[PDB]
Copies of this chain bind each other. A is one copy, B any other.
Amino acid sequence: GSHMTYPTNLEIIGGQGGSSFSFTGENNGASLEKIWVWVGGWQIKAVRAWLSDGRDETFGVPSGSHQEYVFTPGECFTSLSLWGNGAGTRLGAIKFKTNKGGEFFAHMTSWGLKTEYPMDVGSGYCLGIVGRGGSDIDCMGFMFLNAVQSTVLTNVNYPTINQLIPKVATEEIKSVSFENKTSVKQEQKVETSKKVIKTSSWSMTKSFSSTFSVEVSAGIPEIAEVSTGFSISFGVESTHSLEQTDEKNETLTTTVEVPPKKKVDVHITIGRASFDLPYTGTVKITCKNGSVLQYETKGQYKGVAYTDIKVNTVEKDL
């Protein structure tokens, strides 16, 4: 009596005729964005569906005018009910509600509805539709992602990182001139503080990101000034949110050596690097029931990073 769970929830209602179809985003996380439904006297006549990745297909044969539902980003199902045509030979009706307060009811027009089949919408995130059609919709179900435990973007790579040439802007923090007219050496302490705002951003479709809290397990591009110039590095892997902002007061204390009969001008700066480059990674969705749905993705990473505070001293003779 072993028990198998799945990342998706699908209950098909109707008869056994027609030819099989599967129109879902279980390959790439795409969701149902729009649905057109044509009804007949004793069946659902046809369905045309659009997924968030641009796929568009029609099942059954349209007749007359259609009812539409357009889903907006983050709009999930709150409930779903299907009816057969009462004769066990066709789908008869579709009823659903969404988390934005929308409702949709399309039903056959001649025969009355009999047994209602209320569905578990899982997470509410609808991956699409599965069933059988021919002239009509013989049977159909809506596929849902089951209730989600975590959604992690991981195995992140930046394919062009090693070709990228860092665009570093200089930010002036402070300058001071010191003067030593004595014939002995002198030392001057200089303290520096500077707010740095580090940012990380990994692009993702608004519908997926608005529905799920995506944690990122990734290194980020980092900037540092070395001898030859500015170096970009693929940083160590850690946890981030999809959009992240970290603020800090970066500080430094410097002791400047001011030699006899010379003035030393001290220039303190920091470099701000803007990153904008493609990433690849894997979305791993872990459902509450222990199952996993995963797929490969790619998008754009945007980031702001800072170098260390840099101190530059120049000796003058006056």
**A residues apposed to B, CB below 8 Å:** 77-79, 97, 99, 101, 116, 118-124, 146-151, 171-178, 190-193, 195-197, 210-213, 241, 245, 247-249, 251, 253, 288-289
Assess the B191–A212 pair: CB atoms within 8 A: no
User: CB < 8 Å: which of B121, B172, B197 contacts A174?
Assistant: B121
Assess the B124–A174 pair: CB atoms within 8 A: yes
Assess the B176–A118 pair: CB atoms within 8 A: yes
Cα A146 to Cα B249 in complex, Å, equals 13
Cα A188 to Cα B192 in complex, Å, equals 63
Which residue among A118, A196, A210, A289 has the maximum number of chain B CB atoms within 10 Å of its CB?
A118
Beyond A78-B173, A124-B174, A147-B253, 7 additional contacts (C-beta under 8 Å) are: A77-B174, A79-B176, A97-B175, A120-B174, A147-B192, A147-B193, A241-B247
Cα A101 to Cα B213 in complex, Å, equals 41
Which residue among A175, A191, A247 has the maximum number of chain B CB atoms within 10 Å of its CB?
A191
Which B residues lie within 8 Å of A197 (CB)?
213
User: CB < 8 Å: which of B78, B147, B150, B190 contacts A120?
Assistant: B190
Residue of B nearest to A268 (CB): B78
25 cross-chain CB contacts under 8 A? A77-B174, A78-B173, A79-B176, A99-B172, A118-B176, A118-B177, A120-B190, A122-B191, A122-B193, A123-B193, A146-B191, A147-B193, A149-B249, A149-B251, A151-B249, A195-B210, A195-B211, A196-B213, A197-B213, A212-B249, A213-B248, A213-B249, A241-B245, A241-B247, A253-B288
Which B residues lie within 8 Å of A173 (CB)?
78, 99, 124
Cα A150 to Cα B251 in complex, Å, equals 10
Main secondary structure of the interface of A (DSSP, over half): strand
Closest CB of chain B to A263's CB: distance in Å? 9
Which B residues lie within 8 Å of A193 (CB)?
122-123, 147-149, 288
Which B residues lie within 8 Å of A116 (CB)?
177
Assess the B174–A195 pair: CB atoms within 8 A: no
Closest CB of chain B to A292's CB: distance in Å? 14
Closest CB of chain B to A37's CB: distance in Å? 21
Assess the B119–A171 pair: CB atoms within 8 A: no
Assess the A213–B247 pair: CB atoms within 8 A: yes
Which B residues lie within 8 Å of A245 (CB)?
241
Closest CB of chain B to A74's CB: distance in Å? 8
Which B residues lie within 8 Å of A151 (CB)?
249
Assess the B212–A195 pair: CB atoms within 8 A: yes
Cα A42 to Cα B97 in complex, Å, equals 81
Residue of B nearest to A247 (CB): B213
Closest CB of chain B to A90's CB: distance in Å? 22
Residue of B nearest to A172 (CB): B78
Pick the 10 closest A-B CB pairs, nearest first.
A147-B191, A213-B247, A147-B193, A79-B175, A118-B177, A148-B193, A191-B288, A78-B172, A213-B249, A123-B193
Which B residues lie within 8 Å of A78 (CB)?
172-175
Closest CB of chain B to A40's CB: distance in Å? 27
Which B residues lie within 8 Å of A195 (CB)?
210-213
